[PDB]
TrEMBL record, chain C:
<keyword id="KW-1133">Transmembrane helix</keyword>
<dbReference type="GO" id="GO:0000139">
    <property type="term" value="C:Golgi membrane"/>
</dbReference>
<dbReference type="GO" id="GO:0012507">
    <property type="term" value="C:ER to Golgi transport vesicle membrane"/>
</dbReference>
<keyword id="KW-0325">Glycoprotein</keyword>
<keyword id="KW-0391">Immunity</keyword>
<dbReference type="GO" id="GO:0098553">
    <property type="term" value="C:lumenal side of endoplasmic reticulum membrane"/>
</dbReference>
<keyword id="KW-0472">Membrane</keyword>
<comment type="similarity">
    <text>Belongs to the MHC class I family.</text>
</comment>
<dbReference type="GO" id="GO:0031901">
    <property type="term" value="C:early endosome membrane"/>
</dbReference>
<feature type="disulfide bond">
    <location>
        <begin position="203"/>
        <end position="259"/>
    </location>
</feature>
<dbReference type="GO" id="GO:0055038">
    <property type="term" value="C:recycling endosome membrane"/>
</dbReference>
<keyword id="KW-0597">Phosphoprotein</keyword>
<protein>
    <submittedName>
        <fullName>MHC class I antigen</fullName>
    </submittedName>
</protein>
<feature type="domain" description="Ig-like">
    <location>
        <begin position="185"/>
        <end position="271"/>
    </location>
</feature>
<keyword id="KW-1015">Disulfide bond</keyword>
<dbReference type="GO" id="GO:0002474">
    <property type="term" value="P:antigen processing and presentation of peptide antigen via MHC class I"/>
</dbReference>
<feature type="disulfide bond">
    <location>
        <begin position="101"/>
        <end position="164"/>
    </location>
</feature>
């Protein structure tokens, strides 16, 4: 039984501007098995309406998924992605860096 | 989704051309089949359209033409043999994870060609030497009708076509027997030139 | 240039809890156009691209019945493979299947493939000749012998070289305004000082299609991969993709480093430099 | 379109 | 290949029967048909893979199960009230259009109300006549099976230990010994035509074999005569110079 830790990327669909509608994406990839839990957080609390893509996999059979939600960034609000997987001893938090 | 075979019974003389029609109602991509069931045998595949040439040649000189525009898979053979007498089934599959659909079938009867008819009635004795005998009306023309018995104490079978393949000789025959007293082979087939020994 | 249609199937056994979870997805190049999810309420294959909306209801009936038949086979395979590997009846396992066809720039057949995996590792796959199989272990040799004796490769070859190519050409024609498009990457660079002597130069590529792209850093015209960080190409969520490559350079020498972007949508290779 | 029902392993 | 229930079998009004069907062809898909005269093959049940079956067109009154890959048993309940029916089993690699179906031998299932009138046949061979031998240089042997009920027989000719098909024709259907009765016994005739030279050889050994399908060892017999079980009745003949 092979197990792969997911790779996590949190980012917006478009370049972020305060007061402009956008989409917050959390991309998980390269993991196995497909059982995974992903949440998008706003100031530490989970966002309710979070959609996700249909499960697919790569050439090495590792899975990937895209979680996304509509949002409007501000100067104060901090966003992050919370991912739990059988290869993680504890849930992993990845914050959205607004200036990469 | 249905498969239509128009003629349900075809009677042909030997060496004549065969043409069995088949149409289907499905409108997408299909695979097509012809099954033959010889008398006393199991249903078996005659030919099939896998892919490629619409004119699909098969065993025993059979050929089918897949006309995609007209939704037909007619089966043809230029010269029918007597051994082609069987039931033929058209079948079409629709590639929708649905079971293969068969037509209602077409029974093919090939009139046997008797080259040298020599009609006669013979008496055959039991091999166990029980003084029991039967009458055999054989070697008559294929256009001669063997009428049924007109008395329940007399038994007359239908006409029967055998083929001695080693000699290329086909002949008709019918058997009659009765447990009566006045029953004789000269009076057995009187219900239907014939040689009487 | 070249094009491809691919279908992905995943089945995950839930021992005791019920029937396996089943997810199927179809792609033309980098675009998903259909999906099926056994946990969805519709229990039907569903559209995911605007150009597949042109298909009539008989299309979605046939696709639904065929994709459900895939999950039936996988359900039995999960039980069969558990016996081949002498595994417990309570453990959850995974079956993955992928097949499709590639065509060249002239839309002629290029290659086909049909691959199978158990628990994330290769199990069996069709060879490029579309006539023989590659078994990954001893348990898969049993499947190989079973599939060779049944001439399974002949049926798959008819789909891959035929039906697969014919419908890929149809999809490219029906969705030429989006499938045959090329979105050139919109690029930019960012600068952030790591320490008093280091600086981070991040080369960005946004909103491009298709996903295939190349980002390379050069020191003085020669390629450099010493301190070059490169992340996986990621989807933006609108049909386009994103990608960046970063390097840590000594503060004061940023004018030497250059970022080179190669993409199908660019008539010329882009060159990026921080002043 | 998808292929038809595959053969079991 | 495919092996199913015997070619003939009967049931009682109120009794259920189970028709077996087995194949060692490693096929996933199996099928059950009823071949009605004039309607062709009509699908009863089909199973694309183990543990999965779906109703056909005439599934009413029937029941199936697919617990093993090899077996697809069809049970005919008492609600199915056809006095006679012919059932066909088939299998294919998958349900895919590229896979043709392979059919079993078939099974005719009749409704026999009273087993009292079941009788095995009596077989006799009738030797060719010298008149035909002199007139046509050929020799016709006639086999006659009489006094059997129901009309569940299978006649074959054997020459020097080998089953022969050339020069053989058998009546397509038996005739009634008492044609006015509904439970009349049946009779069946067959012919084997052979050259006069072949018949006139004393070494040549001819045999007519009739396979009769009647009661089984699991049945119950409470009559005076012998139990009319499934058996083979034969009659021989040798050449005469």
């Amino acid at each position: 039984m092979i197990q792969r830790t997911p790779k996590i990327q949190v980012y917006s669909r478009h370049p972020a501007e305060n007061g402009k509608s956008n989409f917050l994406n959390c991309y998980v990839s390269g993991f196995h098995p497909s059982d995974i839990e992903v949440d998008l957080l706003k100031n530490g609390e989970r966002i309710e309406k979070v959609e996700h893509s249909d499960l697919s996999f790569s050439k090495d059979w590792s899975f990937y998924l895209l979680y996304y939600t509509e949002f409007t960034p501000t100067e104060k609000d901090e966003y992050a992605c919370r991912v739990n997987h059988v290869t993680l001893s504890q849930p992993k938090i990845v914050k959205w860096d607004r200036d990469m | 989704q249905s498969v239509s075979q128009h003629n349900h019974h075809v009677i042909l003389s030997e060496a004549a051309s065969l043409e069995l029609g088949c149409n289907y109602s499905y409108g997408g991509t299909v695979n097509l089949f012809w099954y033959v069931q010889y008398p006393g045998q199991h249903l078996q595949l005659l030919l099939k359209y896998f892919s490629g040439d619409p004119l699909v040649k098969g065993i025993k000189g059979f050929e089918a033409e897949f006309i995609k525009s007209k939704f037909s898979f007619n089966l043809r053979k230029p010269s029918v043999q007597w051994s082609d007498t069987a039931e033929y089934f058209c079948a079409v599959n629709a590639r929708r994870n649905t079971p293969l659909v068969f037509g209602k079938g077409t029974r093919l009867s090939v009139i046997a060609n008797i080259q040298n008819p020599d009609p006669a009635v013979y008496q055959l004795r039991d091999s166990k030497s029980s003084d029991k005998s039967v009458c055999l009306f054989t070697d008559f023309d294929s256009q001669t009708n063997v009428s049924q018995s007109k008395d329940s104490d007399v038994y007359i079978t239908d006409k029967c076509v055998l083929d001695m393949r080693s000699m290329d000789f086909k002949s008709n025959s019918a058997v009659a027997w009765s447990n009566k007293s006045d029953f004789a082979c000269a009076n057995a087939f009187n219900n239907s030139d014939t040689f009487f020994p | 240039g070249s094009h491809s249609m691919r279908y992905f199937f995943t089945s995950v056994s839930r021992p005791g809890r019920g029937e396996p979870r089943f997810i199927a997805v179809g792609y033309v190049d980098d675009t998903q156009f259909v999906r099926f999810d056994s946990d969805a309420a519709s229990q039907r294959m569903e559209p995911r691209a605007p150009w597949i909306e042109q298909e009539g209801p008989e299309y979605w009936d046939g696709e639904t019945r065929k994709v459900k038949a895939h999950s039936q086979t996988h359900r039995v395979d999960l039980g069969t493979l558990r016996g081949y590997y002498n595994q417990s009846e309570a453990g959850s396992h995974t079956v993955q299947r992928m097949y499709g066809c590639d065509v060249g720039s002239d839309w002629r057949f290029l290659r086909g493939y049909h691959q199978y995996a158990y628990d994330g590792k290769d199990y069996i796959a069709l060879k490029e000749d579309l006539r023989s199989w590659t078994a990954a272990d001893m348990a898969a040799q049993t499947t190989k012998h079973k599939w060779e004796a049944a001439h399974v490769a002949e049926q798959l070859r008819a789909y891959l070289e035929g039906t697969c190519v014919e419908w890929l050409r149809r999809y490219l024609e029906n969705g030429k305004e989006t499938l045959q498009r090329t979105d050139a990457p919109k690029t930019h660079m960012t600068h952030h000082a790591v320490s008093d002597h280091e600086a981070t130069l991040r080369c960005w590529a946004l909103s491009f299609y298709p996903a295939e792209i190349t980002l390379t850093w050069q020191r003085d015209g020669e390629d450099q991969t010493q301190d070059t960080e490169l992340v996986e190409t990621r989807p933006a969520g609108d049909g386009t993709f994103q990608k960046w490559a970063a390097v840590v350079v000594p503060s004061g020498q940023e004018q030497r480093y250059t970022c080179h972007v190669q993409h199908e949508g660019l008539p010329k290779p882009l060159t990026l430099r921080w002043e | 379109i998808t292929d038809q029902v595959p053969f079991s392993v | 290949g495919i092996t199913q229930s015997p070619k003939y079998l009967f049931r009682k009004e109120g009794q259920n029967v189970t028709l077996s069907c087995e194949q060692n062809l490693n096929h996933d898909a199996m099928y059950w048909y009823r071949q009605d005269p004039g309607q062709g093959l009509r699908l009863i049940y089909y199973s694309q893979i183990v543990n999965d079956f779906q109703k056909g067109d005439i599934a009413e009154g029937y029941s199936v199960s697919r617990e093993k890959k090899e077996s697809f048993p069809l049970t005919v309940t008492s609600a199915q009230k056809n006095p006679t029916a012919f059932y066909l089993c088939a299998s294919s690699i998958t349900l895919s259009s590229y896979n043709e179906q392979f059919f079993g031998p078939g099974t005719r299932l009749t409704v026999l109300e009273d087993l009292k009138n079941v009788f095995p046949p009596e077989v006799a061979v009738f030797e060719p006549s010298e008149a035909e031998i002199s007139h046509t240089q050929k020799a016709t042997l006639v086999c006659l099976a009489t006094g059997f009920y129901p009309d569940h027989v299978e006649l074959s000719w054997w020459v020097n230990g080998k089953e022969v098909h050339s020069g053989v024709c058998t009546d397509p259907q038996p005739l009634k010994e008492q044609p006015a009765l509904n439970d009349s016994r049946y009779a069946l005739s067959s012919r084997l035509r052979v050259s006069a030279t072949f018949w006139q050889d004393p070494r040549n050994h001819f045999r007519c074999q009739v396979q009769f399908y009647g009661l089984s060892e699991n049945d119950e017999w409470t009559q005076d005569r012998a139990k009319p079980v499934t058996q083979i009745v034969s009659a021989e003949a040798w050449g005469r110079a």
